[PDB]
């Protein structure tokens, strides 16, 4: 079983999407973690297209299974009597978003348009796997330090994508847009492109922009950092008041701020090697 297969190493994180641990697969000593979530926990099941009940997160990272690299590979999975074990693909070495921002502080330009740009390839690949993530944050990112690729991990809050209106929520609030606060209505991906202006602003200023359900209401943006003007207009775009007044994926990839944008391979060599 599950057991013998992988070498348990040190847990690497735990939270709301529950406790995480390095590991090894023992037949040919892959890096992989492992993510143990309590059945208890787990609202939104969900199935694979044989029939069996898995929680949502397995029937979301199925989806979004490819050789991409931007988003993590769930490479196998166990049901146990009172937990869902998943195994997941773990790049070596890796720092998630959030950490790399803490220890760094605000990110250069050059470096926030890399990471913000694979960030947007990741989202478009999930909604185009018909997978919403509903989580996109820092805390959310994986940082594969040696090639400078990012991917998105932590599906637990997601759902199947659909045009229609989304009445429940439970990623996290301060990303969450002014049409949730208010009214507990949004529609995905003008949700999405709010949360994305969120990190996008996280990515320059070192920090999230709103931290009261009033500042996300009035959703004025004050730069507490120096930030260049064709970077504020995108970020004072995606956090627009009104969903339709907010730019689709393919405005913010054609914006002025988004233009030649460096590879992977250089993003690590300039920023992170
Ligand atoms: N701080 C992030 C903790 C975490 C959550 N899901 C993961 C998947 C892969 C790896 Cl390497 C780590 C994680
Ligand atoms: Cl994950």
Not at 17 to 32: A, E, H, Q
């Amino acid at each position: 079983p599950l057991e013998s297969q992988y070498q348990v190493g040190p847990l690497l994180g735990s939270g709301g999407f529950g406790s995480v641990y390095s590991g090894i697969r023992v037949s040919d000593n892959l890096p992989v973690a492992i993510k143990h979530v309590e059945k208890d926990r787990i609202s939104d099941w969900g199935e694979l297209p044989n029939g069996t009940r898995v929680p949502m997160e397995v029937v979301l990272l199925k989806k979004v299974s490819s050789g991409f690299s931007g988003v993590i590979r769930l490479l196998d999975w166990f049901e146990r009597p009172d937990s869902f074990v998943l195994i997941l693909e773990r790049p070596e070495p890796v720092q998630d978003l959030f950490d790399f921002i803490t220890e760094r502080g605000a990110l250069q330009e050059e470096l926030a348009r890399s990471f913000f740009w694979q960030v947007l390839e990741a989202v478009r690949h999930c909604h185009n796997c018909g997978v919403l993530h509903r989580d996109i944050k820092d805390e959310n990112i994986l940082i594969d330090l040696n090639r400078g690729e990012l991917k998105l991990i932590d599906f637990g809050s997601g759902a199947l994508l659909k045009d229609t209106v989304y009445t429940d929520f439970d990623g996290t609030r301060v990303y969450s847009p002014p049409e949730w606060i208010r009214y507990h209505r949004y529609h995905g991906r003008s949700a999405a492109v709010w949360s994305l202006g969120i990190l996008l602003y996280d990515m320059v200023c070192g920090d999230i922009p709103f931290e009261h359900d009033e500042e996300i209401i009035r959703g004025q943006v004050f730069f507490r950092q120096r930030v260049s003007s064709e970077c504020q207009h995108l970020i004072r775009w995606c956090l627009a008041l009104r969903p339709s007044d907010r730019p689709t994926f393919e405005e913010i990839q054609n914006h002025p701020w988004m233009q030649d944008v460096l590879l992977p391979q250089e993003t690590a060599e300039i920023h992170l090697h």
